[PDB]
């Protein structure tokens, strides 16, 4: 509901970022 | 300004401008279905059809 999605979203932004980092470096 | 039957509105229960569903649907010369109330507002903002990028001369 109100904040169920809010946390979910924050997770996607966090993950994505951490992924880019793992990538950029492992590249 | 709507000469198109309501059946067309029931067929195309959406809008690319205002979204949602309305009964006052009108067919544009570019082969698009837009509600008159939405078209009126857009016709005052511009004269080019969204999914066409071309100005209508009719």
């Amino acid at each position: 509901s109100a904040d169920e999605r809010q946390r979910m979203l924050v997770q996607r932004k966090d993950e994505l970022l951490q992924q880019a980092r793992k990538r950029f470096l492992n590249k | 300004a709507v000469a198109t039957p309501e059946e067309l509105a029931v067929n195309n229960d959406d809008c690319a401008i205002c979204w949602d569903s309305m009964q006052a649907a009108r067919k544009l010369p570019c082969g698009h279905l837009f509600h008159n109330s939405c078209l009126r507002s857009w016709l005052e903002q511009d004269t080019s059809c969204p999914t066409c990028r071309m100005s209508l001369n009719i």
Partner: protein, 156 residues
Amino acid sequence: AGTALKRLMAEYKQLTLNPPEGIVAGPMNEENFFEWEALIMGPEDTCFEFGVFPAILSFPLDYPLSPPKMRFTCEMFHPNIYPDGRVCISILHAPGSAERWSPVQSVEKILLSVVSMLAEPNDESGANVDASKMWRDDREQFYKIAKQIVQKSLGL
């Protein structure tokens, strides 16, 4: 709950239903669908690959009759982006001419144009002249600064 609210809410719903790779966007708060945060990660094989770029999208009240104000919250080196972070693209160009703003342009499509401009920096507006000139004058130096921006965005 007018046109803007209905449309904006539907767009976010889809963004959480079918999410694109490297594209995390949505409103900052459920009680505020006028301020969206977009996390766009530069696509691989480009000069901005792995770049998790944070951008702020301020939407208008007559949406989608008017385009949203997209501004980067981080440093950038793109010709189509002002030094202040304001993005300048024909797709977001309100007419009050091949590419212009249209109510049919959803946020998803808006982001697509940005990603495309990141892969193919086509200076049409001329916001960051320092970059616009360098892009044509020295492609090597451009790539150097471009990749450097990636380090700064990722935080490395």
